[PDB]
Amino acid sequence: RPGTVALREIRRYQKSTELLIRKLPFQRLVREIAQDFKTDLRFQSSAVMALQEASEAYLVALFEDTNLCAIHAKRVTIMPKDIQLARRIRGERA
Amino acid sequence: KGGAKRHRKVLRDNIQGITKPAIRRLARRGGVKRISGLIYEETRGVLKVFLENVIRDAVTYTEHAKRKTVTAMDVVYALKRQGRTLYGFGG
Amino acid sequence: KQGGKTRAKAKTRSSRAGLQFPVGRVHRLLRKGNYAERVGAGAPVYLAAVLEYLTAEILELAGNAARDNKKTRIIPRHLQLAVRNDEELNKLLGRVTIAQGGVLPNIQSVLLPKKTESSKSAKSK
Amino acid sequence: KAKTRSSRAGLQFPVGRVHRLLRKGNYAERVGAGAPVYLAAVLEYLTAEILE
Amino acid sequence: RAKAKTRSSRAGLQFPVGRVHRLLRKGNYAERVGAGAPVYLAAVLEYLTAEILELAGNAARDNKKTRIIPRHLQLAVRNDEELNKLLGRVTIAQGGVLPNIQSVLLPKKTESSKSAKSK
Amino acid sequence: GKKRRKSRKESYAIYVYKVLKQVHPDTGISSKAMSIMNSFVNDVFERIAGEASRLAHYNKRSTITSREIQTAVRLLLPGELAKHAVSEGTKAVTKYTSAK
Amino acid sequence: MAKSAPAPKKGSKKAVTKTQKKDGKKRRKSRKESYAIYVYKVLKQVHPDTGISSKAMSIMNSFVNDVFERIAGEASRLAHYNKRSTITSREIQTAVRLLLPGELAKHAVSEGTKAVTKYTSAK
Amino acid sequence: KKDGKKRRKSRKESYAIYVYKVLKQVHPDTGISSKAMSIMNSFVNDVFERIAGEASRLAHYNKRSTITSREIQTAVRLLLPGELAKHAVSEGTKAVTKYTSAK
């Protein structure tokens, strides 16, 4: 039984067209990062959604790369090793 | 040996000129301790696809300049556009 | 008016701020590239100052790398060592390829067999 | 004015708007008349194929 | 017939090059002085003053302050090793001390492992 | 003035809809899709225009003509897409030549 | 020591061999603009006892041209983004914070602010 | 038109304004305090005395009976560590050329 509905989650989440990260914590998250660089920054409704969509798609693309790292090492789970390798090979880490 | 005098079989062999010692030096320079047998063939394949993409852009640059001779500037434009910028030739 | 006068304004090179790089050549190159409809005199001076510092900084580190290799003339290896030494320089010159360069001595730990190479149970296979 | 440049070439995308953006972007000192018509056709072709 | 430009402005410097010329003669360091000495000395002083002030501003930013106070001066002159050698013996008025703690002083007996926030 | 806020917004959404109604006349489009299409069309124009400008500077000409863009079209578009786009580009210029 | 503004002398030095003395000469090639004299000059100031080879000089020559294209190209990008047609000092300064990383931008901005102040407050 | 008010015009030997000026050149939007300025004023005086003292000793040792850029260049290398000595010598060479280049 463990892992059975994980495959079911693939079917629903890959034809759903929505955002998975909670919007309100992300709304306060962009303010905290932006405030340190400069103070008194006003955001917009489109700005939050545009920033969130790029971040979520980046994670999905990153997770797919780590998926190929798991099968490479005869694994089914994404250890932190997979993410570290994917960032270096893609050149995003440095 | 003038004229056409062209012999072309169904296969090609100039790729095989890059052989195991040539591949071995690159593997050692990258720190790879040991290299498998089929990597030699794949490395030749990786060289073929990488060169093909570069020449496609470079050919367009060369003909746009009405040039029958390739120059360091033309290959730089293809390399810079693809992101693999080269410093040392041209400028 | 058309009145003759002596040299009242500074009849020196356009790099009046002590810069050695020519801001004038940067100015015409800006016009050559058609970057902007109007180009102020501040841009070529500012660009040269950044370029002059960047040129001096790399050569300073390249010379230090040359001292490590015990060489007087700066070679592309010394320049590549400076670029790949600091993260700020490495990030900026990330995917660039240098001519006649080398490879930094980076080695993975798994490729050095040093713990009782004889065997894992006793002193031989 | 009876017909536009886009209609003359058979294209639906505004060739003149592409010409304005080319002048706005300062890509070249001078612009040929055959340039925007070629760019508009390629842009229009890609839009039609993807929508197809 | 007037002071059109100053020696500092002639050399592109801001420090009082002319004052250095008088100070060199005031101290009786030598029988005579040359023209290259004040310009060489003024540029050296400008680099030292600016770099420490540049580092002081960075230290002030880490301390969430914009007005440079003597605390920021002390932090800058003890972090860098090169500044440590020059200003190791001199003392800073109103300055503090860097947050240094020995291994034996932590709760665990002779243990120095902590979270990756300051070390 | 009287209620003048007609700032020109460069949008291809209306033109994307019109060509949509010709390849597939009995079809509709959503505004959200038009926003993506408008950004996609503008980005493609910027890439080709940016590529075209570089080609003119390489040849020391600083002039953009159908030859420059046709080379730029061949540079980025793949083999199948470029050859069909080249014919479409060649069709447009040769049709516009015989006009008026 | 005479006037040479007339057009006929604008293009000359052909190899027609109309020579009275100094036979060795050729035709004016396109000026491949290089920064070799400036790179060498700044090298001596920071390191008087350090030389450099021609291969490194060619690498640097391409480096300035590529960097100049990057910084000026980025500078023209945000000039259109804010609907501006004149670039004097703010577009590049903003581009410096964009192109160069944190520490590198700080050095470029600080020296650039010093340079523009030195350029002004005179003449 | 004569002195009139007087008896409190002395002690110009302070580098307070110059330290303030160089601060704005590198950091335009930051401030300073008199307590910090006093240390900078003391720092310049202490550094200059050490540098000028080293130059004075070199002149006595070599019987040159003069002070020029060469004496300070030797003194700069002695006092400053390697990283600081390299930059200080570069600044001195950079500034010397500009002064000699023109009036």
Nearest in space to D38 (alpha carbons), one of F92, C98, B19, G47: F92
Q: Give the residue carrying structure tokens 């291994």.
A: E103
- The C-alpha atoms of residue G90 and residue C36 are separated, in whole angstroms, by 13
Residues of G in contact with B86 (CB under 8 A): 62
Tokens of residue G26, six digits: 């050729």
Nearest in space to D5 (alpha carbons), one of D33, D43, D27, D44: D33
- The C-alpha atoms of residue H20 and residue E50 are separated, in whole angstroms, by 10
Q: Determine the distance in angstroms separating the CA of H8 from the nearest CA of chain G, rounded to an integer.
A: 32
The data reach a resolution, in angstroms, of 3.6
Whether the CB of H103 is below 8 Å from some CB of chain C: the reply is: no
Nearest in space to D11 (alpha carbons), one of B20, F80, F92: F92
Domains (range + CATH), chain E: 6-91 (1.10.20.10)
C touches G, CB cut-off 8 Å, minimum 3 pairs: yes
Q: Are A51 and A41 in contact (CB under 8 A)?
A: no
The number of C-beta contacts closer than 8 angstroms across B and C is 26
Q: Which residues of E72-110 are buried (b: 16+ CB within 10 A; e: fewer)?
A: bbbbbbbebeebeebbeeeebeebeeeeeeeeeeeeeee
Partners of residue G51 on adjacent β-strands = C73
- Give the torsion sign (CA, B74, B75, B76, B78): positive
Experimental method: cryo-EM
- The C-alpha atoms of residue E42 and residue D47 are separated, in whole angstroms, by 66
Angle H34-62/E36-62 helices, nearest 10 degrees?
A: 150
Label residue E94 left, alpha or beta by phi (over 0 means left) and psi (-120 to 50 means alpha).
left
- The C-alpha atoms of residue D11 and residue D19 are separated, in whole angstroms, by 14
Q: Domain tally for chain A?
A: 1
The 3-state DSSP class for residue D30 equals strand
Q: Determine the distance in angstroms separating the CA of H24 from the nearest CA of chain G, rounded to an integer.
A: 9
- The C-alpha atoms of residue E10 and residue H97 are separated, in whole angstroms, by 11
- The C-alpha atoms of residue C51 and residue G64 are separated, in whole angstroms, by 7
Q: Are D1 and D8 in contact (CB under 8 A)?
A: no
Whether the CB of F68 is below 8 Å from some CB of chain D: the reply is: yes
Partners of residue C97 on adjacent β-strands = B86
Residues of G in contact with H93 (CB under 8 A): 45, 48
Domains (range + CATH), chain B: 8-91 (1.10.20.10)
Q: Give the residue carrying structure tokens 């093909």.
A: B52
Domain ranges, residue A25: 1-94
Distances (CA, A) of H56 to E20, E25, H73, H91: 14, 11, 13, 21
Task: Tally the residues of chain E.
Answer: 119
Q: Determine the distance in angstroms separating the CA of G75 from the nearest CA of chain D, rounded to an integer.
A: 13
Residues of F in contact with D5 (CB under 8 A): 96
Distances (CA, A) of G82 to C37, D18, G79, G86, G105: 14, 20, 6, 11, 21
Residues of C in contact with H102 (CB under 8 A): 12
Nearby residues of F15 by Cβ (< 8 Å), 6 or more positions away: D12, D13, D14, D47
- List the beta strands (DSSP E) in chain G: 51-52, 86-87
- The C-alpha atoms of residue G111 and residue H100 are separated, in whole angstroms, by 23
- The C-alpha atoms of residue C98 and residue B86 are separated, in whole angstroms, by 6
Nearby residues of G110 by Cβ (< 8 Å), 6 or more positions away: E54, H25, H26, H27
CATH number, domain at A24?
1.10.20.10
Residue C97, amino acid: T
- The C-alpha atoms of residue A33 and residue A47 are separated, in whole angstroms, by 14
Residues of C with CB under 8 A from a CB of F: 32-34
